[PDB]
């Protein structure tokens, strides 16, 4: 779903030769690791056993890590075009 | 009766319309390509293999719209309010002359439909070539009409306008060029 | 309880019909009980049986086994083209004309016709006479001109009734074909015999009380 | 009439005559459309006759919305009409009309949207449009078979 | 079906005046002769077994879920036979994998 289905290609309009900006990005990285809990805030985050979640009211949720490729392309007046591209590191 | 493709008709039609032959030769294949590649004939998809190829029905629709507008031009006497293009053509002809338009202009459908059906069932690429060839044949036949003199001008302008409309629609299906996306009256533009 | 249509009493339908005062048309289980007059003739089952057969509403559509809408005309009998399927109707048409010379195709007959083939099995099943059908139709729609063929002969011969429309029916918005379809609907739903609103009739046995000669109140069952 | 409503991420609540959907993918000729529904026009039998009757009636019945393109044999004009009607961000459908590139953008976007949206299980590309229409004709055949009892 | 010869479109009937002419939206008219003069009909015969169940009746001898009865097939002399009961009239049809159809269908 994340990779194939959620591709974004929209164009928005707001140096006076610039009329619109075409935002294009797509995710190619997604993994769901096991639930984690941060013990004393400054911890390395540790495994969250189900009973700990049940007793503390925490949600047995594993973090989702994402990484995307982004293409910011600006279309100017009279057809001049510039492309800004970035490789975005895996975040969560 | 045996049939055979002839590139002369497309060469002549391209010369008359002043656009390059590869533009008409690829009718139905305008999708997703810049008009520059259309005219240069770059990346022309191979001839159809299956009778389910959308190009066959695209060219058939083109020939159909040509014949439809031509028969509208022939039968102006029937219309209580004819389509705007035949009106623009024949606003300066009397009712008797409008009936003479039907009596004078030759039918051009021949047996296109049965032939195209058999060809598509049998050979899709041959059906595509036959539809292109028939459209060009009809256009040049109309443009080659010489008698009577008064209808020659009307027939010529009609044929030019109609083939230009067909090619214009085909180009309108093609990929848009660099253009201002603000013309659509809203903030956002999605693909 | 029965859930079949025409006698719908499932769940709360009948109590709702009573309490909510639904009008006559909205009632789904409308039943009428009628007693035979002259209670000598009321004692026997067969007489009640064909009285119930008499009272049943018989509409035209039930007697019909084929009906076709035709753009034809029978202005006099010149030649005229009909549907070549039902083109052999002229031979019996002439037979009708010579056997019924009181009535001739009226001058206002329109270019519309209906060819109806009678279900012989039903009209012999319910004892409906052809003359009854035709006189009821011509009395209910003089606005339409009806021609009937000879039918008493035998099997194999299909009883063909041809009905043509005259201008006075078209005299109304809507085109002529919708007028013809409307006329087909109107005469299709016409009543041949019976009573409006009755779908079925049946004979039942009731236990009724009557006084004898000597003042004794007996409960009769053979009524 | 017989109307086709397509609901997806792109489309919503829009009711379209069926023959219009058939002809904006090609084969604007209605004889081929009736053939795609009944699978054989030259065939005899009562089923084909009723099919033809109802389909012709549905074709000739007017529509409140798609009247301008009801009798249009031009595939491009109908595609542009639908793209105007269904696409957002097109609030004044006359300014972009002059620019041929805006018309090209709308038409190409609409055709890509329909390729993705109409009967995607048959395909999601341009070369599958005829087979999508064949399957749509089969669906209409099944529906009208059910109406036959 | 009447289709316009030039543009293959549906042509309305236009029942005028003494004859029938089929008129297209492009103006073509093709007239009408005899067999075009039927407008509509609705035959009364509650029977579709001839076409509604034709495929089903053909496939029945190969259907494993169909009921069988102990009778001999006159054509191939199998001693079992699949039995079909169709419609409101409860028409009983006996068929076999050899094509036997028992005078019905
Ligand atoms: Zn036409
Ligand atoms: Zn056998």
XYZ file of C-alpha atoms and ligand atoms in Angstrom:
762
model
C 0.000 0.000 0.000
C 2.639 2.508 1.089
C 4.850 2.085 -1.971
C 2.513 1.317 -4.876
C -0.701 3.046 -3.906
C 0.267 6.292 -2.148
C 2.114 8.184 -4.846
C 1.553 11.939 -4.622
C 1.597 14.263 -7.645
C -0.052 17.629 -6.990
C 0.670 21.145 -8.231
C 0.225 24.309 -6.170
C 0.279 27.986 -7.129
C 1.209 30.968 -4.953
C 10.792 35.302 -9.164
C 7.492 36.655 -10.459
C 7.926 34.217 -13.368
C 7.130 31.278 -11.059
C 3.479 30.267 -11.425
C 3.233 26.808 -9.840
C 5.182 24.136 -7.969
C 4.629 20.452 -8.731
C 5.164 18.323 -5.617
C 5.948 14.681 -6.380
C 7.119 12.150 -3.820
C 6.851 8.419 -3.224
C 7.843 6.127 -0.368
C 10.125 3.174 -0.959
C 10.839 1.990 2.554
C 8.368 0.770 5.162
C 8.883 -1.760 7.937
C 6.957 -2.352 11.152
C 9.165 -3.421 14.060
C 7.959 -4.821 17.367
C 6.465 -2.586 20.081
C 8.941 -0.506 22.055
C 8.804 1.453 25.296
C 11.225 4.129 26.481
C 12.092 3.316 30.075
C 13.404 6.579 31.578
C 12.843 8.951 28.639
C 16.564 8.986 27.786
C 16.620 5.211 27.259
C 17.412 3.331 24.072
C 13.755 2.181 23.961
C 13.141 -1.410 25.069
C 10.795 -4.272 24.283
C 7.188 -3.790 25.388
C 5.773 -7.085 26.590
C 1.983 -7.396 26.196
C 1.213 -7.531 29.919
C 3.118 -4.287 30.475
C 0.893 -2.644 27.867
C -2.254 -4.129 29.397
C -1.380 -2.986 32.911
C -0.124 0.502 32.017
C -2.823 1.143 29.423
C -0.211 1.436 26.687
C -1.046 0.388 23.148
C 0.687 -2.707 21.773
C 1.910 -0.778 18.742
C 5.128 -1.233 16.813
C 6.760 1.786 15.193
C 6.562 2.271 11.430
C 9.737 3.481 9.718
C 9.413 5.308 6.402
C 11.723 6.640 3.698
C 10.701 8.568 0.598
C 12.069 10.050 -2.608
C 10.816 13.581 -3.247
C 10.708 15.615 -6.461
C 9.903 19.314 -6.075
C 9.549 20.676 -9.609
C 8.695 24.325 -10.250
C 7.105 25.402 -13.524
C 7.751 29.023 -14.477
C 6.022 31.281 -16.952
C 6.706 30.648 -20.663
C 7.498 27.016 -19.854
C 10.783 27.221 -17.940
C 11.151 24.324 -15.525
C 13.416 23.470 -12.587
C 13.578 20.234 -10.588
C 14.656 19.900 -6.954
C 15.191 16.343 -5.723
C 16.108 14.854 -2.353
C 16.681 11.359 -0.970
C 14.979 11.385 2.420
C 16.455 9.071 5.087
C 14.359 6.447 6.902
C 12.409 8.217 9.649
C 9.623 7.069 11.971
C -12.502 -8.472 -53.938
C -8.876 -8.469 -52.772
C -7.532 -5.471 -50.865
C -4.064 -3.977 -50.484
C -2.647 -0.996 -48.610
C -1.345 1.978 -50.614
C 0.915 4.616 -49.070
C 0.221 7.012 -51.941
C -3.125 8.030 -50.461
C -1.557 9.005 -47.129
C 1.297 10.836 -48.880
C -1.202 12.847 -50.936
C -3.445 13.548 -47.943
C -0.453 14.691 -45.887
C 0.596 17.006 -48.714
C -2.925 18.441 -49.001
C -3.326 18.949 -45.250
C 0.353 20.147 -45.175
C 1.064 17.996 -42.085
C 3.583 15.154 -42.200
C 2.410 11.650 -43.208
C 3.368 10.068 -39.884
C 0.762 12.257 -38.162
C -2.156 10.628 -39.964
C -0.429 7.241 -40.179
C -0.533 6.961 -36.368
C -4.161 8.003 -35.769
C -5.360 6.344 -32.587
C -1.785 6.216 -31.260
C -1.637 9.883 -30.219
C -1.976 8.897 -26.560
C 0.829 9.839 -24.188
C 3.161 11.280 -26.831
C 4.341 14.785 -27.592
C 3.126 16.120 -30.920
C 6.754 16.566 -31.980
C 7.289 12.804 -31.793
C 3.922 12.358 -33.517
C 5.042 14.410 -36.517
C 8.573 12.983 -36.526
C 7.082 9.504 -36.150
C 9.238 8.630 -33.147
C 8.113 5.782 -30.927
C 5.226 4.668 -33.116
C 3.720 1.609 -31.408
C 3.822 -1.583 -33.482
C 0.829 -2.521 -35.627
C -1.987 -4.118 -33.624
C -1.960 -7.878 -33.088
C -5.281 -8.418 -31.282
C -8.742 -7.369 -32.413
C -9.137 -5.886 -28.913
C -6.614 -3.155 -29.705
C -8.033 0.295 -28.836
C -6.356 1.780 -31.924
C -8.732 -0.104 -34.223
C -11.777 1.401 -32.540
C -10.098 4.817 -32.388
C -9.555 4.938 -36.144
C -13.027 3.482 -36.679
C -14.449 6.314 -34.569
C -12.485 8.797 -36.677
C -13.877 7.394 -39.928
C -17.336 7.305 -38.352
C -17.232 10.961 -37.327
C -16.044 11.915 -40.809
C -18.902 10.004 -42.447
C -21.400 11.367 -39.917
C -20.467 14.980 -40.605
C -20.336 14.334 -44.354
C -23.865 12.910 -44.326
C -24.935 15.880 -42.224
C -23.570 18.036 -45.049
C -25.441 15.930 -47.608
C -28.786 15.968 -45.758
C -28.919 19.647 -44.719
C -32.394 19.789 -46.282
C -33.699 17.462 -43.552
C -32.413 19.386 -40.528
C -34.754 21.831 -38.834
C -31.544 23.339 -37.429
C -28.394 21.778 -38.906
C -25.121 21.483 -36.978
C -23.187 24.718 -36.742
C -20.431 23.754 -39.187
C -22.697 22.866 -42.112
C -24.649 26.043 -41.318
C -21.443 28.076 -41.531
C -20.753 26.381 -44.864
C -24.171 26.683 -46.521
C -25.738 29.817 -44.999
C -25.492 31.342 -48.506
C -27.470 28.666 -50.371
C -31.224 28.517 -50.882
C -33.494 25.661 -49.829
C -33.605 24.300 -53.376
C -29.808 24.466 -53.430
C -29.750 22.680 -50.066
C -31.775 19.832 -51.582
C -29.455 19.871 -54.594
C -26.644 19.365 -52.086
C -28.184 16.000 -51.213
C -28.877 15.204 -54.866
C -25.319 16.092 -55.915
C -22.842 14.975 -53.262
C -21.880 11.316 -53.821
C -22.156 8.776 -51.041
C -18.731 7.818 -49.701
C -19.471 5.118 -47.106
C -19.285 2.398 -49.794
C -19.017 -0.803 -47.728
C -16.602 0.391 -45.066
C -18.397 -1.146 -42.096
C -18.619 -4.745 -43.314
C -15.050 -4.619 -44.626
C -13.727 -3.216 -41.343
C -15.652 -5.836 -39.365
C -14.227 -8.685 -41.432
C -10.715 -7.229 -41.331
C -10.696 -6.682 -37.564
C -12.006 -10.208 -37.021
C -9.299 -11.475 -39.386
C -6.304 -9.095 -39.200
C -6.145 -6.196 -36.717
C -3.129 -4.454 -38.259
C -4.743 -4.704 -41.683
C -7.935 -3.268 -40.179
C -6.014 -0.274 -38.822
C -4.334 0.305 -42.178
C -7.654 -0.080 -43.993
C -9.400 2.435 -41.746
C -6.611 4.996 -42.196
C -6.599 4.358 -45.946
C -10.383 4.686 -46.199
C -10.394 7.975 -44.285
C -7.689 9.373 -46.561
C -9.457 7.994 -49.647
C -12.706 9.688 -48.657
C -10.969 12.995 -47.963
C -9.128 13.032 -51.286
C -12.237 11.874 -53.165
C -14.185 14.791 -51.717
C -11.308 17.167 -52.454
C -11.083 15.787 -56.007
C -14.728 16.534 -56.844
C -14.812 18.843 -59.859
C -18.483 19.038 -60.910
C -20.752 20.888 -60.431
C -18.629 24.015 -59.963
C -20.753 25.665 -57.269
C -20.569 22.716 -54.858
C -16.809 22.261 -55.344
C -15.928 25.169 -53.052
C -18.271 23.969 -50.297
C -17.051 20.372 -50.532
C -13.402 21.466 -50.424
C -13.824 23.675 -47.363
C -15.868 20.979 -45.624
C -13.256 18.296 -46.267
C -10.420 20.516 -45.059
C -12.313 21.529 -41.920
C -13.416 17.970 -41.137
C -10.024 16.319 -41.542
C -8.493 19.184 -39.577
C -11.073 18.607 -36.837
C -10.224 14.896 -36.733
C -6.478 15.518 -36.512
C -7.068 18.318 -33.999
C -9.025 15.978 -31.733
C -6.275 13.373 -32.092
C -3.679 15.954 -31.036
C -5.995 17.002 -28.204
C -5.728 13.436 -26.933
C -1.926 13.683 -27.003
C 0.318 14.721 -24.133
C 0.031 18.391 -23.109
C 3.060 20.611 -23.505
C 4.493 23.171 -21.131
C 1.520 25.334 -20.196
C 0.251 27.444 -17.323
C -1.584 25.293 -14.779
C -3.402 28.277 -13.250
C -6.004 28.498 -16.030
C -8.191 25.995 -14.204
C -9.845 28.317 -11.721
C -8.709 26.752 -8.454
C -5.682 26.665 -6.180
C -4.675 23.021 -6.654
C -4.028 20.874 -9.729
C -3.837 17.082 -9.408
C -2.754 14.354 -11.805
C -50.594 -18.227 9.000
C -50.577 -17.925 5.227
C -48.046 -15.481 3.774
C -49.141 -15.784 0.138
C -50.153 -12.659 -1.731
C -53.802 -11.830 -2.222
C -54.365 -13.223 1.271
C -51.515 -11.439 3.039
C -52.013 -11.619 6.812
C -48.412 -12.114 7.937
C -47.307 -10.374 11.100
C -49.071 -7.093 11.793
C -50.436 -6.375 8.302
C -54.111 -7.009 9.071
C -54.078 -5.279 12.504
C -52.310 -2.299 10.933
C -54.919 -2.192 8.173
C -57.665 -2.138 10.800
C -56.059 0.331 13.203
C -54.357 2.676 10.743
C -57.567 2.891 8.665
C -55.885 2.148 5.362
C -58.354 2.810 2.515
C -59.955 0.076 0.405
C -57.157 0.108 -2.176
C -54.472 -0.371 0.486
C -56.087 -3.490 1.972
C -54.236 -6.694 1.104
C -56.653 -9.279 2.545
C -60.034 -8.034 1.323
C -62.560 -10.876 1.561
C -66.279 -10.747 0.789
C -68.828 -13.331 1.926
C -72.032 -13.502 -0.100
C -75.090 -15.652 0.564
C -77.110 -17.138 -2.274
C -80.647 -15.777 -2.452
C -83.620 -18.164 -2.222
C -82.149 -20.534 0.357
C -83.602 -23.632 -1.351
C -81.073 -23.118 -4.153
C -78.463 -22.276 -1.493
C -78.350 -25.856 -0.143
C -76.607 -27.444 -3.158
C -72.898 -27.063 -3.864
C -72.856 -27.109 -7.672
C -75.226 -24.157 -8.057
C -73.057 -22.076 -5.747
C -70.092 -23.294 -7.791
C -71.109 -21.883 -11.141
C -72.585 -18.825 -9.432
C -69.082 -18.222 -8.061
C -67.751 -18.831 -11.565
C -70.213 -16.206 -12.819
C -69.206 -13.647 -10.194
C -65.466 -13.965 -10.872
C -63.985 -10.962 -12.664
C -62.652 -12.032 -16.063
C -60.545 -9.367 -17.758
C -59.551 -9.266 -21.406
C -55.831 -9.893 -20.867
C -56.560 -13.288 -19.312
C -58.538 -14.375 -22.389
C -55.768 -13.231 -24.759
C -52.898 -15.511 -25.783
C -51.211 -13.160 -28.290
C -51.515 -9.452 -29.013
C -49.600 -7.468 -31.620
C -49.534 -3.718 -32.213
C -49.648 -2.965 -35.936
C -49.370 0.322 -37.825
C -51.872 -0.987 -40.392
C -55.353 0.134 -41.477
C -58.445 -1.394 -43.025
C -59.750 1.635 -44.901
C -62.427 -0.223 -46.867
C -60.691 -3.285 -48.337
C -58.578 -1.895 -51.192
C -55.305 -3.774 -50.860
C -53.219 -2.298 -47.999
C -49.965 -3.797 -46.721
C -50.033 -5.566 -43.368
C -47.352 -7.322 -41.404
C -46.490 -10.302 -43.655
C -46.603 -12.552 -40.593
C -50.327 -11.838 -40.177
C -50.979 -11.235 -43.863
C -53.405 -14.149 -44.407
C -56.028 -12.380 -42.286
C -57.693 -10.900 -45.387
C -59.424 -14.169 -46.326
C -61.284 -14.292 -43.004
C -61.630 -10.498 -43.055
C -63.741 -10.746 -46.209
C -65.713 -13.544 -44.538
C -66.405 -11.204 -41.619
C -67.430 -8.400 -43.966
C -69.931 -10.562 -45.836
C -71.211 -12.163 -42.616
C -71.449 -8.861 -40.680
C -72.578 -6.254 -43.220
C -74.308 -4.067 -40.606
C -70.880 -2.711 -39.609
C -68.133 -1.505 -41.953
C -64.732 0.118 -41.326
C -65.504 3.685 -40.230
C -64.168 6.667 -42.142
C -62.061 7.786 -39.149
C -60.057 4.551 -38.827
C -56.454 5.468 -38.058
C -53.197 3.896 -39.224
C -52.975 1.782 -36.078
C -54.196 -1.729 -35.349
C -54.121 -4.447 -32.710
C -54.244 -8.129 -33.653
C -55.309 -10.314 -30.723
C -55.421 -14.113 -30.731
C -57.941 -15.635 -28.332
C -57.038 -18.438 -25.931
C -59.565 -21.066 -26.980
C -58.724 -23.224 -23.960
C -59.620 -20.493 -21.476
C -62.824 -19.357 -23.189
C -64.033 -22.952 -23.309
C -62.721 -23.384 -19.757
C -64.752 -20.497 -18.309
C -67.602 -20.742 -20.879
C -67.004 -17.262 -22.326
C -68.749 -16.818 -25.665
C -67.083 -14.923 -28.499
C -70.209 -12.815 -29.036
C -70.023 -11.770 -25.381
C -66.415 -10.632 -25.792
C -67.165 -8.638 -28.915
C -70.371 -6.978 -27.725
C -68.795 -6.053 -24.382
C -65.765 -4.603 -26.173
C -67.824 -2.645 -28.704
C -70.075 -1.342 -25.924
C -67.150 -0.338 -23.702
C -65.044 1.197 -26.512
C -67.171 2.469 -29.402
C -64.169 4.814 -29.822
C -62.518 1.725 -31.325
C -63.676 -0.534 -34.162
C -63.537 -4.305 -33.648
C -63.775 -7.153 -36.176
C -64.397 -10.777 -35.163
C -63.893 -14.009 -37.091
C -65.798 -17.299 -37.026
C -64.521 -19.511 -34.222
C -66.920 -22.340 -33.291
C -65.540 -24.703 -35.945
C -62.664 -26.699 -34.479
C -59.069 -26.866 -33.279
C -56.216 -25.542 -35.409
C -58.075 -22.361 -36.372
C -56.830 -19.481 -34.173
C -59.608 -17.105 -33.145
C -58.244 -13.808 -34.465
C -59.797 -10.545 -33.317
C -58.525 -7.397 -35.014
C -59.112 -3.992 -33.466
C -58.289 -0.733 -35.221
C -58.197 2.758 -33.752
C -60.109 5.761 -35.046
C -59.177 9.439 -34.845
C -61.483 10.100 -31.881
C -59.165 8.054 -29.652
C -56.129 10.144 -30.625
C -58.058 13.361 -29.958
C -56.291 14.718 -26.881
C -48.352 16.182 -25.432
C -47.939 12.600 -26.650
C -47.369 10.884 -29.974
C -49.560 8.389 -31.811
C -47.608 5.293 -30.769
C -48.075 6.109 -27.091
C -51.774 6.581 -27.862
C -51.889 3.117 -29.427
C -50.029 1.599 -26.472
C -52.448 3.326 -24.095
C -55.414 1.915 -26.017
C -53.839 -1.552 -25.892
C -53.495 -1.193 -22.124
C -57.056 0.107 -21.778
C -58.788 -2.661 -23.715
C -56.425 -5.314 -22.333
C -57.624 -4.501 -18.797
C -61.314 -4.306 -19.742
C -63.784 -6.556 -17.932
C -65.576 -9.309 -19.840
C -67.800 -10.629 -17.040
C -68.041 -10.499 -13.276
C -67.545 -7.756 -10.696
C -64.827 -5.078 -10.402
C -62.211 -5.717 -7.752
C -62.906 -9.445 -7.309
C -59.835 -11.567 -7.973
C -61.205 -15.005 -7.074
C -64.405 -16.642 -5.874
C -64.954 -19.862 -3.953
C -67.785 -21.806 -2.335
C -67.701 -22.499 1.404
C -69.856 -24.238 4.000
C -71.192 -22.159 6.884
C -73.029 -23.174 10.034
C -76.127 -20.987 10.269
C -79.059 -20.882 12.674
C -82.653 -20.960 11.461
C -86.005 -21.370 13.185
C -88.086 -24.438 12.386
C -91.870 -24.414 12.068
C -92.384 -25.316 15.745
C -90.240 -22.486 17.117
C -87.122 -24.637 17.527
C -83.815 -22.941 16.704
C -81.746 -25.424 14.700
C -78.202 -24.875 13.455
C -78.079 -25.723 9.745
C -74.872 -26.900 8.079
C -75.873 -27.805 4.500
C -75.960 -24.162 3.372
C -32.690 4.409 -19.872
C -29.724 2.417 -18.585
C -27.309 4.547 -16.575
C -23.856 3.672 -15.245
C -22.559 5.233 -12.031
C -18.870 4.758 -11.217
C -17.683 5.344 -7.654
C -13.990 5.430 -6.775
C -11.358 7.691 -5.264
C -11.703 9.967 -8.300
C -15.381 9.745 -9.268
C -18.356 10.151 -6.949
C -22.167 10.017 -7.318
C -21.996 10.719 -11.077
C -24.600 8.969 -13.236
C -23.631 8.410 -16.870
C -25.456 6.800 -19.807
C -23.846 3.494 -20.704
C -23.304 4.110 -24.422
C -21.336 7.245 -23.541
C -18.940 5.170 -21.435
C -18.645 2.711 -24.309
C -17.903 5.348 -26.922
C -15.372 7.467 -25.035
C -13.112 4.394 -25.160
C -13.788 4.033 -28.888
C -16.412 2.424 -31.116
C -18.763 5.376 -31.131
C -20.978 3.327 -33.472
C -24.007 2.141 -31.531
C -24.341 -1.072 -33.548
C -21.034 -2.262 -32.101
C -22.253 -1.301 -28.613
C -25.418 -3.367 -28.961
C -23.221 -6.147 -30.334
C -20.979 -5.943 -27.264
C -24.029 -6.299 -25.033
C -25.898 -9.051 -26.913
C -22.728 -10.729 -28.307
C -24.434 -11.132 -31.693
C -26.702 -8.727 -33.565
C -27.401 -11.082 -36.479
C -28.587 -13.810 -34.102
C -32.253 -14.787 -33.936
C -34.207 -15.741 -30.780
C -36.347 -13.818 -28.309
C -33.522 -12.873 -25.940
C -31.682 -10.879 -28.604
C -34.927 -9.209 -29.674
C -35.829 -7.983 -26.194
C -32.197 -6.993 -25.609
C -32.177 -4.894 -28.774
C -35.525 -3.285 -27.957
C -34.552 -2.192 -24.443
C -31.065 -1.083 -25.475
C -32.368 1.047 -28.345
C -34.957 2.615 -26.054
C -32.258 3.375 -23.476
C -29.994 4.875 -26.140
C -32.682 7.189 -27.506
C -33.941 8.397 -24.102
C -32.757 11.902 -23.249
C -30.611 12.689 -20.220
C -30.776 15.689 -17.862
C -26.989 16.135 -17.655
C -25.194 14.528 -20.612
C -27.462 16.035 -23.279
C -24.675 18.077 -24.976
C -22.654 14.894 -25.595
C -25.684 12.616 -26.001
C -25.474 12.532 -29.804
C -21.766 13.374 -30.051
C -19.749 10.941 -32.149
C -16.486 12.679 -31.171
C -14.680 10.688 -28.492
C -12.454 13.630 -27.540
C -15.388 15.981 -26.977
C -17.114 13.512 -24.648
C -13.871 12.843 -22.777
C -13.391 16.587 -22.299
C -17.024 16.983 -21.217
C -16.662 14.263 -18.591
C -13.330 15.658 -17.395
C -14.984 19.049 -16.950
C -17.913 17.517 -15.082
C -16.071 15.148 -12.752
C -12.654 16.708 -12.127
C -12.257 19.166 -9.299
C -10.235 22.380 -9.650
C -12.053 23.184 -12.918
C -14.443 25.905 -11.774
C -14.775 27.941 -15.004
C -14.890 25.512 -17.939
C -14.256 28.217 -20.534
C -10.906 29.861 -19.696
C -8.875 26.682 -20.205
C -10.833 25.944 -23.393
C -8.812 28.388 -25.497
C -5.484 26.851 -24.448
C -5.055 23.610 -26.381
C -2.519 22.378 -23.829
C -5.051 22.730 -21.004
C -7.539 20.690 -23.041
C -4.826 18.104 -23.689
C -4.059 17.954 -19.967
C -7.710 17.464 -19.032
C -8.320 14.817 -21.699
C -5.168 12.845 -20.890
C -5.872 13.051 -17.154
C -9.441 11.846 -17.668
C -8.355 8.918 -19.825
C -5.711 7.872 -17.295
C -8.260 8.188 -14.479
C -10.773 6.016 -16.325
C -8.110 3.458 -17.245
C -7.318 3.175 -13.545
C -10.922 3.353 -12.319
C -13.293 1.610 -14.745
C -13.178 -2.191 -14.282
C -9.542 -2.215 -13.088
C -9.518 -5.994 -12.633
C -9.521 -6.421 -16.411
C -6.568 -4.038 -16.606
C -5.232 -0.602 -15.792
C -3.665 0.367 -19.129
C -4.872 1.745 -22.445
C -4.579 -1.521 -24.387
C -7.283 -3.162 -22.238
C -10.059 -0.674 -23.014
C -11.822 -2.829 -25.610
C -11.803 -5.864 -23.324
C -13.099 -3.703 -20.471
C -15.964 -2.698 -22.742
C -16.543 -6.347 -23.663
C -16.830 -7.218 -19.983
C -19.133 -4.243 -19.382
C -21.357 -5.473 -22.195
C -21.378 -8.904 -20.570
C -22.444 -7.326 -17.269
C -25.280 -5.454 -18.978
C -26.301 -8.692 -20.690
C -26.502 -10.443 -17.323
C -28.520 -7.603 -15.766
C -31.047 -7.553 -18.582
C -31.224 -11.348 -18.460
C -32.260 -11.032 -14.819
C -34.914 -8.484 -15.807
C -36.290 -11.111 -18.212
C -36.997 -13.471 -15.297
C -32.609 -3.347 -35.358
C -32.288 -0.534 -37.888
C -28.833 1.062 -37.966
C -27.806 3.985 -40.143
C -25.721 2.744 -43.052
C -23.398 5.757 -43.049
C -22.672 6.171 -39.333
C -23.966 2.943 -37.705
C -26.228 4.734 -35.223
C -29.660 3.868 -33.877
C -32.474 5.135 -36.104
C -35.830 6.071 -34.570
C -39.066 4.744 -36.072
C -41.129 7.946 -36.563
C -44.475 6.370 -37.389
C -45.500 8.861 -40.084
C -47.555 8.872 -42.054
C -49.018 5.956 -43.978
C -45.609 4.306 -44.077
C -42.646 3.988 -41.726
C -39.331 5.738 -42.385
C -36.341 5.241 -40.098
C -34.597 8.556 -39.514
C -31.081 8.926 -38.134
C -29.547 11.851 -36.292
C -27.414 12.509 -39.388
C -30.488 12.692 -41.628
C -30.318 9.326 -43.390
C -33.682 7.671 -44.061
C -34.068 4.086 -45.216
C -37.853 3.665 -45.507
C -39.646 0.451 -44.552
C -41.287 -2.525 -46.263
C -43.792 -4.962 -44.748
C -41.642 -6.565 -42.046
C -40.823 -3.170 -40.508
C -44.486 -2.420 -39.753
C -44.701 -4.277 -36.428
C -44.647 -1.872 -33.484
C -44.824 -4.044 -30.367
C -46.207 -7.351 -29.166
C -46.437 -9.375 -25.971
C -47.305 -13.040 -26.462
C -48.919 -14.867 -23.551
C -47.176 -18.186 -22.970
C -45.473 -18.761 -19.606
C -42.752 -20.831 -21.222
C -39.020 -20.191 -21.383
C -37.797 -23.791 -20.979
C -36.936 -23.809 -24.691
C -34.267 -21.120 -24.231
C -33.987 -20.268 -20.527
C -32.867 -23.782 -19.565
C -31.365 -24.880 -22.897
C -27.808 -24.600 -21.575
C -28.843 -26.153 -18.263
C -30.707 -29.033 -19.910
C -27.734 -29.732 -22.173
C -25.278 -29.687 -19.261
C -27.506 -31.659 -16.879
C -26.257 -35.208 -17.673
C -22.763 -34.026 -16.712
C -23.926 -32.304 -13.536
C -23.070 -34.574 -10.582
C -25.611 -32.857 -8.327
C -28.609 -33.726 -10.501
C -31.076 -36.366 -9.382
C -30.910 -39.706 -11.181
C -33.550 -42.406 -11.577
C -33.284 -46.097 -12.433
C -34.498 -46.135 -16.029
C -32.967 -47.354 -19.266
C -31.901 -44.877 -21.924
C -33.548 -45.812 -25.250
C -30.501 -44.629 -27.205
C -27.477 -46.013 -25.327
C -29.158 -48.366 -22.808
C -27.498 -47.058 -19.689
C -29.652 -48.177 -16.776
C -29.504 -44.815 -14.961
C -30.898 -41.503 -16.163
C -30.776 -37.967 -14.801
C -34.154 -36.380 -14.114
C -34.913 -32.666 -14.447
C -38.034 -30.909 -13.186
C -38.478 -27.445 -14.674
C -40.791 -24.524 -14.072
C -44.092 -23.887 -12.365
C -45.746 -26.592 -14.467
C -43.178 -28.998 -12.956
C -42.281 -30.408 -16.357
C -40.218 -33.579 -15.921
C -37.441 -34.033 -18.487
C -35.270 -37.143 -18.715
C -31.848 -36.679 -20.305
C -28.662 -38.690 -20.718
C -25.001 -38.107 -21.524
C -25.581 -39.694 -24.947
C -27.851 -36.833 -26.051
C -31.199 -38.502 -25.356
C -33.846 -35.916 -24.500
C -37.155 -37.804 -23.995
C -39.262 -35.843 -26.497
C -38.794 -32.615 -24.516
C -36.256 -29.931 -25.339
Zn -26.601 8.183 -39.393
Zn -28.170 -42.396 -23.183
